[PDB]
Structure 1
Amino acid sequence: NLYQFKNMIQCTVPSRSWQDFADYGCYCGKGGSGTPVDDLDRCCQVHDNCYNEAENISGCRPYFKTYSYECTQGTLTCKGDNNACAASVCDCDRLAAICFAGAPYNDANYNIDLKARCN
């Protein structure tokens, strides 16, 4: 769920407030369309597409599904007790969190005008 994803981000990118990734580019946060503006945005595009794919699973609601995971000593792990939905969503979140840690963060790309720039 989003609370868990927030925690994944806190654990792979502790140097930033989680909310720095909640409204960035065309894909990080509410936005889900247009040109990814940079590599961080591309991380979010993949994440968004990953969620859309997980939503094909019956009863699978990525913002809400509580999965089983651990973040310890620099590593994120999706646990074995996860059902197909939980495993898929956890993997989406894990890969995105790792992606965020390796992407440059451009302040100019925070809170962009989605209606104008993400068609």
Structure 2
Amino acid sequence: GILELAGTVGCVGPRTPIAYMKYGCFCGLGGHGQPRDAIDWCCHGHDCCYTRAEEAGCSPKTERYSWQCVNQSVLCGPAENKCQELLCKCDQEIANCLAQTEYNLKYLFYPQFLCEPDSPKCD
């Protein structure tokens, strides 16, 4: 869920999860257009992951799951079901993705009217 998403991102990366709350075209609720940079690609890929999780019959924004932060790395588990494993995998992936990125301040609160109607495909 959102609590774990924030935690995992904070665990691995060098910056507050708030840094991604409305950034580029994809970091934040929803998202569309051409991803603006590496961080925006991470969020695009995460949005895709959550959509897949929803299609599998999970609730990616709400379901709690256990994880550990060890040496600024996310370890997923113990998982009680498949949704908890999918969710944790999604969040672990974006945490790892964002941790390797440099922040472009100019994309924080980027104007949504510049984000194109269509988006790159998932997978």
TM-score, normalising length: structure 2? 0.88
Structure 2 spans left out of the alignment, 5+ residues: 118-123
Partner residue in 1 for 2:9: 9
1:20 aligns with 2:19: yes
Secondary structure in 1 matching 2:74 = strand
Structure with the largest fraction of strand: 1
Offset, 1:117: 2.2
1:63 aligns with 2:61: yes
CA contact (8 A) 1:78 1:90 kept: yes
Equivalent pairs counted in the alignment come to: 117
Offset, 1:36: 0.4
> C-alpha deviations, 1:22-75, integer Å up to 9, x for none?
1111111113211000111000000000000000122x1101011121112222
Identity %: 32
Secondary structure in 2 matching 1:96 = helix
Partner residue in 2 for 1:100: 98
> C-alpha deviations, 1:78-109, integer Å up to 9, x for none?
11424111111110000100101101110001
Structure 1 spans left out of the alignment, 5+ residues: none
Take 1:114 and 1:82, find their aligned partners in 2: how far apart are those partners? Answer: 38
| Worse-matched range after superposition: 26-35 or 98-107 | 26-35
CA contact (8 A) 2:32 2:115 kept: no
TM-score, normalising length: structure 1? 0.91
CA contact (8 A) 1:25 1:109 kept: yes
Offset, 1:16: 1.8
- Structure 1 runs of 4+ with >2 Å offset: 115-119
Offset, 1:20: 0.5
